[PDB]
Amino acid sequence: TINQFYGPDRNKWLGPYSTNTPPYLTGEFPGDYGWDTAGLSADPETFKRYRELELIHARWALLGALGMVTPELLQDDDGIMFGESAIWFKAGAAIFQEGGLNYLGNPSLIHAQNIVATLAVQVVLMGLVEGYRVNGGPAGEGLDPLYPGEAFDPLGLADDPEAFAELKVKEIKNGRLAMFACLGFFVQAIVTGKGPIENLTDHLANPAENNAFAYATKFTPQ
């Protein structure tokens, strides 16, 4: 049950071929597969800083991946509800259209045209949010830096902590998959010029040739 993820006999980063797991990764935190072969977390305070940083990165990248996938999925046939903005890495130009960016095909949602104004509002709101996250505010004052769960857990969910630990590990591995997929989205954007859903459809069209090896000679210096 819980011994698979939070003990000496837990799942590791090489399976049965990993006995040299670092001694300071005893295993009491989400994830903790023993993968610190470069030793950047020897100091415990550095370890907790990197853990908090990794969980915040994971929680950002889950939304990042689902926001880079969703509008390309919701693109229609003729592409009148989305212009070039359906692709995630050219969505910013949606703010520079003749009517600005609308949330969907109809113009009654958002319909913003001032990138400077929306950026200023975004910076102010995100600064207040991050200040509340690192200090405490209306949503909480002295809660956990990663798991407040008072105003951020309205649906309850986190009962019987022997299962809440498994839920935490679910969160950290889903976030790790999201960060890996986000890196994949970035590198696909650099070399292919098409969206990730388009890359998936083109790979399913012909997997024997439509892969990264088709673009392996792109950055060749001439």
Partner 1 sequence: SAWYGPDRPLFLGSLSGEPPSYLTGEFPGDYGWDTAGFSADPTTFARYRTIELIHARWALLGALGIITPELLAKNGVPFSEDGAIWFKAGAEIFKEGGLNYLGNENLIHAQSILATLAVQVIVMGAAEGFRANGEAPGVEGLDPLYPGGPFDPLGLADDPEAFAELKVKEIKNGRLAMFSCLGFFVQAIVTGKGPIQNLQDHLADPGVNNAFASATKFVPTP
Partner 2 sequence: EFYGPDRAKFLGPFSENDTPEYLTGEFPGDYGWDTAGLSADPQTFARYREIELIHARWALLGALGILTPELLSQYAGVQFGEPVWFKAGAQIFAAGGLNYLGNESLIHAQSIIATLAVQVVLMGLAEAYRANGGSEGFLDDLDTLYPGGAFDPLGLADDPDTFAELKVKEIKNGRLAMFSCLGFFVQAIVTGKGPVQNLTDHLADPTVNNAFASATKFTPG
Partner 3 sequence: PDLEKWYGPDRKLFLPGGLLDRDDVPEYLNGELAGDYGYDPLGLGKDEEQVEKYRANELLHARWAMLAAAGIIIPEGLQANGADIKGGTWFETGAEMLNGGTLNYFAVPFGVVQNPLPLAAVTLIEIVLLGAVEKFRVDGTGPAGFSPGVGKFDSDIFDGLDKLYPGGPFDPLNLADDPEVFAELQVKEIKNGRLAMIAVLAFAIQSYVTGEGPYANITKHLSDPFGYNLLTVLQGDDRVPTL
- Judged by beta carbon distances under 5 to 8 A according to partner kind, the member of partner 2, partner 3, partner 1, none in contact with residue 22 is partner 2
From the list 69, 81, 95, 214, which residue makes contact with ligand CHL (rule: CB under 6 A)?
95
Angstrom CA distances, 8 to 25, 26, 124, stand at 10, 7, 45
| Other CB atoms within 10 A of residue 58 CB | 21
Is residue 217 near partner 2 by the rule CB under 8 A?
Answer: yes
Query: Binding mask 7-46 vs partner 2 (x if CB under 8 A, - otherwise)?
Result: -------xxxxxxx-x-x-----------xxxxx-xx---
| Residues 143/136, Cβ–Cβ less than 8 Å | yes
Tokens linked to 103: 């949330």
For partner 3, give the closer residue by CB, 40 or 104: 104
- Measured from the Cβ of residue 31, the count of other Cβ atoms closer than 10 Å reads 23
3-class secondary structure, 140: strand
Asked if 184 touches partner 1 (CB under 8 A), the answer is no
34 in Cβ contact with 28 (< 8 Å): no
Residue ranges in contact with partner 2 by CB under 8 A: 14-20, 22, 24, 36-40, 42-43, 213, 216-217, 220-222
Residue ranges in contact with ligand CHL by CB under 6 A: 11-15, 17, 33, 89-93, 95, 115, 118-119, 122, 176, 180, 186, 189-190, 213, 216-217, 219-221
